[PDB]
Structure formats: C-alpha cells, structure tokens
Amino acid sequence: VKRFFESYHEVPDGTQCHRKTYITTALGGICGIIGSAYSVSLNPADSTLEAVARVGRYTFTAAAIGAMFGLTTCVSAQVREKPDDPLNYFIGGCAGGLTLGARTHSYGTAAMGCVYMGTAAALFKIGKLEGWELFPTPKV
Amino acid sequence: MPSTFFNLTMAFSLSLLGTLMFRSHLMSTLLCLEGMVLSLFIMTSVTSLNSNSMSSMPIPITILVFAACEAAVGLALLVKVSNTYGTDYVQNLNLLQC
Amino acid sequence: MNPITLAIIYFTIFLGPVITMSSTNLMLMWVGLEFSLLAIIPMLINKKNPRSTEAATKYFVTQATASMIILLAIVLNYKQLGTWMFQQQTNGLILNMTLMALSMKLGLAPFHFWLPEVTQGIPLHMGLILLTWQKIAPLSILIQIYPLLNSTIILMLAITSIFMGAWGGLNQTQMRKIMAYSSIAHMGWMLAILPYNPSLTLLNLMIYIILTAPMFMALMLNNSMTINSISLLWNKTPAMLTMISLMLLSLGGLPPLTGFLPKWIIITELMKNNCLIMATLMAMMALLNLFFYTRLIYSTSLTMFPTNNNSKMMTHQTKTKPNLMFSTLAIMSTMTLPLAPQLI
Amino acid sequence: MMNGRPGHEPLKFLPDEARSLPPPKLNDPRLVYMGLLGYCTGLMDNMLRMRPVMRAGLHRQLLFVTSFVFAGYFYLKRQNYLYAVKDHDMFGYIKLHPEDFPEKEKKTYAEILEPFHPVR
Amino acid sequence: DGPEKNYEKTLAILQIESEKAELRLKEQEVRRLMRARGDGPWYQFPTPEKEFIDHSPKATPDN
Amino acid sequence: KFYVREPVNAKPNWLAVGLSVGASVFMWIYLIQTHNEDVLEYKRRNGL
Amino acid sequence: QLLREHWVHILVPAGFVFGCYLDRKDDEKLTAFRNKSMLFQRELRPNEEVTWK
Amino acid sequence: MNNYIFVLSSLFLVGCLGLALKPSPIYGGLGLIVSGFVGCLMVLGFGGSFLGLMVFLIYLGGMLVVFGYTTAMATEEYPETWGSNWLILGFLVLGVIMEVFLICVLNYYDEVGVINLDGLGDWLMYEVDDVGVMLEGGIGVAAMYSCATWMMVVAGWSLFAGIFIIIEITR
Amino acid sequence: PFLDIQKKLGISLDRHFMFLSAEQPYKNAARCHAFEKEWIECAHGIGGTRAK
Amino acid sequence: ISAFLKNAWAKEPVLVVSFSVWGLAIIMPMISPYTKYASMINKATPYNYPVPVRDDGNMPDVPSHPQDPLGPSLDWLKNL
Amino acid sequence: LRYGLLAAILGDKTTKKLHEYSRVITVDGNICSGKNKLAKEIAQQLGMKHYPEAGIQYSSTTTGDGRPLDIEFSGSCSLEKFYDDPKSNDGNSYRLQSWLYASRLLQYADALEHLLSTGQGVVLERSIYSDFVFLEAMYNQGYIRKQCVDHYNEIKRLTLPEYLPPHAVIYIDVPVPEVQSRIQKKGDPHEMKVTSAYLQDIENAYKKTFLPKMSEMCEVLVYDSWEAEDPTKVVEDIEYLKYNKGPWLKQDDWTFHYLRMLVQDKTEVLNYTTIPVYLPEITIGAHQGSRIYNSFRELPGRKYAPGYNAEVGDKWIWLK
C-alpha cells in the first residue's frame, strides 16, 4: 500500500540505503509522472510518439533526481556518524539539484536547484525532527 | 438495489469522462451532459422508490426541469457558435488565448 | 436588452445566490447555482462577437460540468443518509467531490484556466459581476459544511491557487486577465482558512469585493483594458491616480492599507492552528502580486507614458461617469485598517 | 463559532441582551475616525468629479459625514455586544470546567534556578 | 509632574497588558476544548430539526 | 452666460439639497435620542 | 478682514493643545495604582485628595 | 426474472458508454434514446410509473430537437459511427470487457458488498404497503401543488426565465 | 442555511421535507421512519460534534 | 374601449375567447357557492384506516360505535 | 434627469418623435464645390439643422466658452502649414487628418444626438464616411506613410461601425480644372498651393470608393454644378426621395435608446480615437503633454466642471 513510503522512517537515517533509495526513486518517479501528465495535457505533443518520449524523459529525470537524493543522504549519514542532522539532507538535496542540472545541461539550473532543493530537504528533515505537520487538521 | 446503484454510478462516471475528454464536437459534449443528467435522475428515482419517501419525489422532476433549461441554453450557444464559425468544432473557440 | 428582459434577467441573477444562501435543502442550493449559471450567460454573450460567444461557451461548459458533479455528490449523500443535507457521517469521498466541484465553479487552481479567458472575453461590468457576485453562492455552501471539509485537500488547492495566481499575473498586459488572476489569488487565501475559521473567509471576501468593485469601476471610467491604455490616465483623468495607486497597493497587501488585514488575520489563525509551513509559503508567494501591482503603479501614477494628440479633444469634453459609490468604496478599502478590531 | 450559541436569534442585528451594555460614547475615537473617513469620501468625490474640493456640495459632505457616523455608531454597538458575548461564554465555560483550567503555582525566583549565560 | 506619576502609570500599563496576555492565552485553550469536545456554547454544529417530524398515526401500524 | 451649452449643473437640485439637509438633521436628532435612551436603559438595567 | 489668509496659523497650535488634552485623558485612564505602589505609598496629606492627579 | 434489473443496468451502462465515446451526434442521440428507454424500464421495475414514463417522454422530445439541431449544424460530410473509427470501436469493446471483468473482480473481493451476483434480485423491493391504496409515485410528484409548492415555484420561474434567456442569446 | 431567513420569518419553504421521518402524503410512513426519528431526536439539543 | 374590443373580436376572435376563458376560470371559483364542497369531499374520502382512540372518560364527543349519532356526518354529501 | 433607461421607460422615445424630414443629409464634393451654400439652403428650406463642416476648432467652439483655443490645445496642426509643406517632417499632415476625423466623429455624434432627441433632421457637409478621401489623396501624393494609413483605418474600423449612416448623400461633381479655377478666384494664399494631382486623387476616391459604397445603404444624389446652383431643385429631389434601404429600417425604440446612450456621452464617442498606438506623428510625449494639459486646465472656465467655475460667473457652488 502507501505504507511503503512511510517505511522510510523505520531504521534511523544512514541505514538501509538500498531501501531508502528505492523509496525516494519511487517518489521522484511519481512526481515526474504527474508532471509529464500535465505537460502532455496542456501543451500537447505534436505526435503520440513524441508525447510518450516526453513522458519518458520527465519520469526518468525525476526518478534519477530522487534516487540521487536518497543515496547521497544515506551515504553522507553513514560516512559521518551523524544519523539525525539536517546537513545530510542538505547535501542530498544539493546532489539532486546537481542531477537535475546535469540532465538538463545547464550550470545555472544546476546551482539554483542545488541550493533550493538542499534548503527544502533540510527543512523537511527539521520538520520531521521538530514535529511540524504539513496540513494540520483544525484544532483551534 | 446495490448492484443497480453501482451500475448507475459507473454510468454517470462514464458520462462525466465523455464530457471531460472532448472530441471536436460541442453537440457531443452537450449529449454527454444530458447522459449525466439522465443517470442522476434514475439514481434519485430509484432511491426515492426504494425508501418509500414519497415527499422527495418532487426533486427528480425539478432535476429534469433545470437540466432541460440548461440544455436549451447550451443549444442556443451552439447556434451562436455555428453562426460565428460555420461548424460546432471546439478548435475554433480559442481566440481568448491572448 | 429591453426593460422587461433586463428586469427578468437581473432578478434571476440576484435570486440565484439568494436562494442558495437561504436554502436548507441541498437540491435548492443546486437550484440557485443553476439559476445563476443560466441567467448570467445572456449578459456574457450580450455584445455578440466571436470572443463573447467563446467566453460564454467556455463558461457554460465548465459550470455545467461542475454543477453535475455537485448534484452527484448531493444524490449520493441522499442515498447514503436518507437526507438532503451533509451530516457528520457523510462520506469523505462525497465531501471531497463536492469540494472539488465547488472549487471548479469558483475558479481555484488547478481548476482555474477557464477564469482568465472568460474574464478577458466579456465587458468590464460583466467581469465585475462575475468576479464579485457570482462567488457568493459557491462559497456559502462550503461555509455551511466547514466542519466536514478536508484540510489537506483545501490547503493543496489554496497553495496551488496562490502560486498560480501570483505567477499568472506577472505575464499579463491585459487588465481583465490581471483582475482574474488577482481573483484566483484572493480566492486561494479565502479557501485557506475555510476549515478553520469561515468568519475570516467572509472577511476576506468582503475586503476583496470592496477593493475589486472600485478597480473595475475605475477601469470602466475610460475602458482601460490594457496597461498602455491605463497609462494615459494622467492625461485623461488625473484625479483618479491617487486612489488607483492606493487600491492596487491594498490589493497587494501592504500593511498600512486595509487589504493587509485579511492576510494578517489569516496568518494569525493558521499559526494558531499550527499551519506554519503553509502560512509561510502563502505569505511569501503573495509578494509576486505586489510586484505586478507595483508595475501597474509605475505605468499609471509614478511616471508619465506618452500620450496622443487626440486626447486633447478628450480633455475638452465633460464627464459624469464616476458614481458616489467609487469614493465610498475606495476610501473604505484603503483607509480602514485603524478600525481592524471591528471588522473581525 | 458563536452561531450555535444557546438563545441565538437568526438575523438579529442587536439582540435585547445588548441593551445591558454601556452605549458607545458619541465622541468615541472610532466614531470620530468614521466621521473623518466620511469627510474624506466627500472630498475625494469632489476631486473625482472635478469640483472645488473643499467648497462644492457642502450638503453632500454633511450627508456623508453624518451617515458614516450613524452607521459607525450602530455597528460599533453591535460589535461591543459581540465581544461581551464572547467574554461571557469564555468565562462561563471556565467556571463550568474547573478541572481543565487549574490554578497556577508560581515558585519565587528565590527557589527558581535559571541558567546563567555569560556574555564574554 | 514627578517620578511618581510615571512609575505608577507604568504599573497600571503593565497590569493591563499582563491581564490581556493571560486572557489571550486562556481564549485559545477554551476554544481548543470547545472545538474538540462540543460541550460549549461555541462550535455547536447543526443537526436535523426535530420540529418537522410527523408524529401523527400513519397508514401502517409499525412506524 | 459663459457656456455655449448651458452647464448640466447650472442651478442646485433644490429637491436634492433639501432632502440631504433634512436627512442629515434627522440622522443626528435620531442618533442623539437613541444615545440618550440607550444610556437610560443601561443605567436602569444595571441599577445606576 | 484679513482672516482668510491668516486663519491657517491656528491648525498646528490647535493640534498641540489637543494633543496635550489627549495626553491628560490618557493619564486619567491609568489612574489605578495611584497611591498603591510599594514605592511612593505615603498617606494623603491633609486636604489632599490625589497624589499626582 | 432475478437478473432483470441487473441486465437493465448493464444495458444502461453500455448505452452511456456508447454515448460517452461520442460518435456523430445522430448516433449519440440514438444511444441516449435507448438509455432513456432502459432507465424508464428500471424506474418501472423499482415500482415507479409516472417518473419512468415522464423521463422517457422528456428525452424523446429533447432528442427530437437535438436531431434537428445536429442535422442543421453539427453535421459532417462523413458522420462518424461507432465502427467508423477503429480506435473508438476498440475502446468500446474494451469498455464492455472492463465492465464484465470489474464485475467479477468485485464479486470475488466481496460477494455481498458492492455487488452480489449470488441472490441477485433478492434485494430489489425492500418493504411495501400490501393493503395500501394511495402509494404510486404520481401522488408524490403531485405533492408539488400543495405540500412542496416552493419546488414548483422555482421550477416554473426557471422555465419562465428560460424563454427570455434563449431569446436574448439567439438574438 | 447560510442566512436564516426562513427561521427569521417563521416560514418553511423547504425545511419540512429534509428527511424520511418528515411528513409524507396520505400518511404513508417512509422506510426506517422510526429509526430516523430516534436518531434525530437523540441528536437534537446536543451539538453535531457530540451527536457523533 | 368597446370599439377596440370589438375590432379584436372581429379580426382575432381566438385570442378574445382565450382571454375570456382565462378571466372566467379565475372568477368562477370565487363566485360559485359550491367551491366549499370541493375540499370537503376530498377530506371525506377515507384512504387510510381511522385508528381508534383509547377511551378515558374525557371523550364525550367522539363516538364509540360507527353507527352512533355523534361524530361527523356525510348527509350533506348524500344530498348535495 | 439625464436620458437613461428610466427616461426611456417614462417616455422620450425616438420613434415617436421621428417624422418625414427626420433624416440625415450629407453634402459632399471636392474642394470649393458649393457645399456650404447647398447645405445652408437645404437646411433652411426643409427645416433641418445646418451643421457647418467640422474643422480644427469644432470641439473648442462646441465646448466651454465657445471661443477658439490655441492650436496647442486644439490639435497642434495647421491647414496652412499642410498646404505650404505637405511633406513636412513633424507629421503635420497626418496629425491634421486624424484631428479632423476625430472632430468629424464628434460632430456626427452631436448631429445624431440632436436628431434622436428632437426628431429634427440634420444637414452635414462631409462626414466620417467621406473623410477618408483626403487621407487617400495624402497617401497617394506621398504626404503620409503606410503606418499612418493603417492607424487611420484601425481607428475608423473601431469607431465608424457603431453609428447609423446618413439617410441621403448629395455629391456635387465639379471637375479638377474648375476646382482649381475656383480656388484661384477665392484667392487663399495658402490654399492656392494645392497641386492638381491632389484634387484628382480626392475626386478619384470620391468616385471609386465613396459613391459605390454609400449607394449600398443610403440614397445617393449626384449633381453637376449647374444643378447644385438653384438649391431648390435639390430640395425638390430630397422631398420626394423614398428611403427603402440601409440600416435605418431595422431600428426600433430599444435600438435608438442604446445608440442615443452611446452618442450622448462624448467621452465614450472619442474613446477609441485615443488608442495607445505609438505612431510618432501623433505621440506627444510626457513633458509637452503635461505642460499643455496644465496650461489648458488654467484657462478660464476650464479649471473645474462647467457648473463650478466661480471665475466665469458660476454661482451657488457651495450647494451644488
């Protein structure tokens, strides 16, 4: 089910690389699938083969970004013992941004993606640690 | 009752899909809207008859009244589109992109 | 239109939302929605040009599909609970379908694409009606079921609306499209606080209307449907520049003006409910709107674009268009922050 | 939140309970600001219609000021009633549920040990 | 006027603002409890109206 | 005497002027009476 | 007379006097603790009604 | 006679699928006429009468007008049927197959929940007044002249303003 | 009702056929009339949060 | 305007008759003396069983048997 | 009570006022053809109102004091400069032509308002329908550019289709040599510089584009000079003209109402002449524009609204 995704937080970060990398690759692939769906819907391709090619490009790029993010985060948290430190997620986000920039063949996109994705991943780690909740229910 | 209502829900979903995915004719989309209305009317009628809720039998007829008014307005718009362009192809209706 | 038709269509336009707001039966709320949808189309297609017909057809198809989805939700709830009203035990998918269909009717992103085009295709007064009066009926139903709505769905819609309105307004040289994207952004803000405090949704609606109606009236004063067209205000009607600047800045949300209070109070309530990330993202992305309003202010009030020779004949004539309502609404929309506690 | 309050009366601007509260003093700062806003509205209307800003339509300006003050007075009375009702409900709920609002026991700074952070 | 005036005006200001602070804190807890439990004047969500139930004898016995 | 087309606002709309002045006077009189009555009711309810 | 040009020289002084009046009113509103602070807690001298008005 | 209503529902679903696939509006209107007939039959089976006959009558008239309008405006030199486009034909057969497949899949995942092929027809009419007299849906619909006159008022006003609306639109 | 005009006026345009347990033509009790009556009467008075 | 009404009768009798029948349909129910019985008969028609009430001694006007003198009488309908 | 839906409901209907001589009659012809005399006589004999040909100062004469204003306020164009240096470099040619078209549009609005409000017909010399002949002659002679022609065509497309055409058009045909001789006889030191090619272009436009087009919708009457003299004959032709053509037949009270509402707001009439098309010949520039606008608003009887200028004798301001 969807608990496959929530399995990401079982073992402390820095362990079960392969598994966390699989999870993040799945997340990236899903995001790329949705983005390709919207791009094909609005802004239609000239041919069905071209549309399928664009879907493949988007999905592969997003999956690669997610896989790199997960692998780099785990490898950092393992090489340095820090098992729950946002800098690991910042490094992973920068690696994902660099992957995006490389796949797009753009140094500016590489750098901006590194910075933005690293900040986003660090904030996600901080939120998981400190107990923030995206989409809180009305408590008042 | 249960299987009938499941089939009616799926029929409405099919009509909604036919509405959402266009196919170069405005009349066909209007017909899909009519099909959605028909499915909803059947669902309401079946529910009222099964519940013996006689006081709720007015509502199915009001559904038809308002659906018919909407269909008439849609047909008037189709007349205007045909006057403007010569056909009811939705490809022409794209002047507002800019 | 002749007087009988004008009366009979304006009464229907006014009655639709009144019936929805006063009805206890979901079917009669839907009837009010249908009244609005049917009665507004002739006024959209009144002028009869290809753009008017295209806008009317787009509006009709979108709104009819949304109404059918809403009726599906109503009928399924009737089947489930034997009642014509959503209860605490109504199914989550039924409520989600209702929310999505009503957001499609309103124009919240990603169900927003139709709105800027339909706004572009119609005269300015019709755009005013569409962006102000027609929002009340869909929002009333949501405000009636605010304890039942899904916070995740509503917040996704709200943040998407904020982002898409902010980014759309940047690329537009057309005043009607800019108004439509401003509508999308403010509706995102309105929907963000619906699950938590619908009184603030009503407050944001009221302030948005009190700001938008004067903006459309000022646009209608000279039929300024473009940035270049509005730039000639310093020559055609200089006196309105100060109020236009202040109204635009209030729409943007600069503190001292009244338009700040909705964003401020909504952020306060979201934070009270522990919605820090979404509140921060919304307040951060609501600055693109200030940017593309300040661009308008530069073009209209803080500089002087080139003018035409013929505008001297314009200057010669006498004008009588601005009602007594423009001054009242503009002052109320700009200079009312000190009375903030009364508004909430 | 207060729309389901017991004794709530639909579409009632000023319930009878509101008569017990003290009326807004008629030279209140808020009412004076509302009058000032009405005056500014008259001035802006003149400026928009191209009339002597401060000299034209004194009858119109008087009507603006008086109408603004009138509406402000009655609306402020309603708002005072609403705030009084809110405080009434809050204190009543606190009285009803003492176990949820226990009293506090503030130790003195003599017995409190706050950490010291040198500024070296 | 003298230092007493400013001193004992600051005392009054501090009292008022501290009381306002404690009330602002209490209102949030009160609202949280009322919303969570539903036993207060606020957040009383509507239910079907029993005034419009038909209690007269029906056509069939078992109703 | 000056304008070729006699100005649309050559003379005051005396009906409008009278009605506006009367409405302002009535609004003020009613406001003062309402304030006095409200104060009296408040004191009577609270026992002075 | 020459009032139409010189009357404008009463606004700012009027603003200052009105500000002094408003300050006195704000002083009145904070009358609590007038003689009730741990410091400055003397008993009223004969024929004295308030410590600092 | 235990599969009667299920067969009617399957026919209605197939008709709505044919309508959704959007052939030429002529065949779309024919499919909608068949669907309206089957819906009338289902309403009749559930004890209705006035409602089924009325829906059939209304849709007969509506599809007549739609036929006139489509021949006058939504026409093409080679109107498209269901078999004309092989993609449409393939998705039609796929829809039939995916209905016959989902029916079995649901019947397997649970045999009593959403669908119950076993005892199909056992749970059609729940409770009925055996010795009653005034029970037909005509009475419920006619309640609009006394008990629920507001519904009549809104419907009548909608139809009244429809004339002005269409006149203005077509002007 | 977002606006309680019907309660304000005392009129009932559409409040008298909101559920099965309401009034039916010729006193033909609906299906589950007793159960809906019991549920509505139990839930009356207390809020919609409590009644859940 | 008897002349105009007349010209209408001469050239467009159908509309004159339509409006005359409209007016007569509106008026006759008010004038007629039998309009009271139209609803009395509908009330008289018994479509549902008349459920008996439990006797308690405080019921002197409601009969005890179908053929008792007390209760509503339908002789007004018997000779209408 | 300004005209509006309320006034139309309470009365003030155009069809009620229209009579036999509630027409629009437009006199046309090359330069110096007798248009002025012919129009004056037609108007005097038929009871209609004469509208002298709109000029550079029509708007100033029709608004405010009624006096002509400085050319900086009235268009920064000069007919004398046009004739002296037709191929200028400040675009006086096209500035003059666009200003004259705008003035003619304003005058046509005034004439239509008069006709619809009172029912009395109007006799106009030339109109927005025949204005384009001068522009075409300018372009053919090289006095303006294709961009100027496109801008003029765009403004005409935006403005002209909103008004009804004249009922009758009366074209006085006089050949180019006689036009030239009449110009010399008049002896205008600047007008005499007009080349014969320009006049021939005007005649070519009149006879190729105007008359065939106007024949579609109006009643056209072509006269030679010897018939244009003795205007009684032209009036006798008009008095028996039968109008069974054009858009005037399909109008009704609730079309005249909206035409009147459009034509009653002079600001809305000229709205589209000021579209922000940045043609150098017409673009002013912020500094000069603000200078001229302030100088204009400092003119007597122009600082405030018409009823609110105490300097020009307006009274009761404090109660208006």
mmCIF file of all heavy atoms in Angstrom, chain J residues 28-40:
data_model
loop_
_atom_site.group_PDB
_atom_site.id
_atom_site.type_symbol
_atom_site.label_atom_id
_atom_site.label_comp_id
_atom_site.label_asym_id
_atom_site.label_seq_id
_atom_site.Cartn_x
_atom_site.Cartn_y
_atom_site.Cartn_z
ATOM 1 N N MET J 28 -64.843 32.298 -11.608
ATOM 2 C CA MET J 28 -65.915 31.396 -11.194
ATOM 3 C C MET J 28 -65.690 30.778 -9.821
ATOM 4 O O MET J 28 -66.662 30.693 -9.051
ATOM 5 C CB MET J 28 -66.103 30.300 -12.248
ATOM 6 C CG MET J 28 -66.745 30.786 -13.540
ATOM 7 S SD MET J 28 -68.436 31.410 -13.400
ATOM 8 C CE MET J 28 -69.069 30.521 -11.980
ATOM 9 N N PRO J 29 -64.491 30.326 -9.452
ATOM 10 C CA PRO J 29 -64.327 29.756 -8.106
ATOM 11 C C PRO J 29 -64.745 30.707 -7.001
ATOM 12 O O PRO J 29 -65.302 30.267 -5.988
ATOM 13 C CB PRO J 29 -62.829 29.432 -8.049
ATOM 14 C CG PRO J 29 -62.434 29.242 -9.459
ATOM 15 C CD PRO J 29 -63.265 30.197 -10.254
ATOM 16 N N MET J 30 -64.493 32.005 -7.166
ATOM 17 C CA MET J 30 -64.889 32.967 -6.142
ATOM 18 C C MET J 30 -66.403 33.118 -6.085
ATOM 19 O O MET J 30 -66.992 33.134 -4.998
ATOM 20 C CB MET J 30 -64.232 34.321 -6.409
ATOM 21 C CG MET J 30 -62.840 34.238 -7.013
ATOM 22 S SD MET J 30 -61.918 35.778 -6.863
ATOM 23 C CE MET J 30 -60.761 35.351 -5.566
ATOM 24 N N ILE J 31 -67.050 33.228 -7.245
ATOM 25 C CA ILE J 31 -68.490 33.463 -7.282
ATOM 26 C C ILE J 31 -69.253 32.223 -6.835
ATOM 27 O O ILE J 31 -70.230 32.319 -6.085
ATOM 28 C CB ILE J 31 -68.914 33.900 -8.697
ATOM 29 C CG1 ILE J 31 -68.229 35.209 -9.110
ATOM 30 C CG2 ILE J 31 -70.426 34.043 -8.776
ATOM 31 C CD1 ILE J 31 -67.902 36.157 -7.974
ATOM 32 N N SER J 32 -68.824 31.047 -7.282
ATOM 33 C CA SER J 32 -69.636 29.852 -7.127
ATOM 34 C C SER J 32 -69.880 29.543 -5.650
ATOM 35 O O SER J 32 -69.006 29.765 -4.807
ATOM 36 C CB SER J 32 -68.960 28.659 -7.794
ATOM 37 O OG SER J 32 -69.567 27.449 -7.384
ATOM 38 N N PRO J 33 -71.066 29.033 -5.305
ATOM 39 C CA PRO J 33 -71.325 28.615 -3.924
ATOM 40 C C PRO J 33 -70.932 27.180 -3.616
ATOM 41 O O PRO J 33 -70.974 26.790 -2.441
ATOM 42 C CB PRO J 33 -72.842 28.794 -3.805
ATOM 43 C CG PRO J 33 -73.344 28.488 -5.163
ATOM 44 C CD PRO J 33 -72.279 28.934 -6.135
ATOM 45 N N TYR J 34 -70.563 26.391 -4.621
ATOM 46 C CA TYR J 34 -70.174 25.002 -4.421
ATOM 47 C C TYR J 34 -68.677 24.827 -4.226
ATOM 48 O O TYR J 34 -68.222 23.698 -4.030
ATOM 49 C CB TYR J 34 -70.633 24.152 -5.610
ATOM 50 C CG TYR J 34 -72.032 23.595 -5.477
ATOM 51 C CD1 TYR J 34 -72.975 24.209 -4.664
ATOM 52 C CD2 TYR J 34 -72.414 22.459 -6.174
ATOM 53 C CE1 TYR J 34 -74.251 23.701 -4.543
ATOM 54 C CE2 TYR J 34 -73.689 21.945 -6.058
ATOM 55 C CZ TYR J 34 -74.603 22.571 -5.242
ATOM 56 O OH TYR J 34 -75.876 22.063 -5.123
ATOM 57 N N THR J 35 -67.899 25.909 -4.274
ATOM 58 C CA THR J 35 -66.457 25.787 -4.111
ATOM 59 C C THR J 35 -66.080 25.258 -2.736
ATOM 60 O O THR J 35 -64.981 24.719 -2.572
ATOM 61 C CB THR J 35 -65.788 27.140 -4.347
ATOM 62 O OG1 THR J 35 -66.026 27.564 -5.693
ATOM 63 C CG2 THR J 35 -64.293 27.049 -4.110
ATOM 64 N N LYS J 36 -66.962 25.397 -1.745
ATOM 65 C CA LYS J 36 -66.652 24.909 -0.406
ATOM 66 C C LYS J 36 -66.644 23.388 -0.348
ATOM 67 O O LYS J 36 -65.871 22.803 0.419
ATOM 68 C CB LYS J 36 -67.659 25.469 0.597
ATOM 69 C CG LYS J 36 -69.063 24.915 0.438
ATOM 70 C CD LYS J 36 -70.120 25.933 0.834
ATOM 71 C CE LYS J 36 -70.019 26.322 2.299
ATOM 72 N NZ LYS J 36 -70.226 25.161 3.204
ATOM 73 N N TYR J 37 -67.490 22.731 -1.142
ATOM 74 C CA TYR J 37 -67.599 21.279 -1.092
ATOM 75 C C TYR J 37 -66.445 20.572 -1.786
ATOM 76 O O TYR J 37 -66.225 19.383 -1.533
ATOM 77 C CB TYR J 37 -68.918 20.835 -1.723
ATOM 78 C CG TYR J 37 -70.139 21.411 -1.049
ATOM 79 C CD1 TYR J 37 -70.816 22.486 -1.601
ATOM 80 C CD2 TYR J 37 -70.612 20.882 0.139
ATOM 81 C CE1 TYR J 37 -71.930 23.015 -0.990
ATOM 82 C CE2 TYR J 37 -71.728 21.404 0.758
ATOM 83 C CZ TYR J 37 -72.381 22.471 0.189
ATOM 84 O OH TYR J 37 -73.493 22.996 0.801
ATOM 85 N N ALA J 38 -65.694 21.274 -2.635
ATOM 86 C CA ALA J 38 -64.622 20.627 -3.385
ATOM 87 C C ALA J 38 -63.574 20.038 -2.452
ATOM 88 O O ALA J 38 -63.064 18.938 -2.698
ATOM 89 C CB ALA J 38 -63.982 21.624 -4.347
ATOM 90 N N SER J 39 -63.228 20.754 -1.385
ATOM 91 C CA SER J 39 -62.273 20.248 -0.408
ATOM 92 C C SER J 39 -62.934 19.396 0.666
ATOM 93 O O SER J 39 -62.287 18.499 1.222
ATOM 94 C CB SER J 39 -61.533 21.413 0.251
ATOM 95 O OG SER J 39 -60.379 20.958 0.931
ATOM 96 N N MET J 40 -64.208 19.650 0.968
ATOM 97 C CA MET J 40 -64.906 18.833 1.954
ATOM 98 C C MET J 40 -65.043 17.395 1.475
ATOM 99 O O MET J 40 -64.878 16.456 2.259
ATOM 100 C CB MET J 40 -66.277 19.431 2.257
ATOM 101 C CG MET J 40 -66.216 20.770 2.967
ATOM 102 S SD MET J 40 -67.823 21.569 3.101
ATOM 103 C CE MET J 40 -68.692 20.404 4.141
#
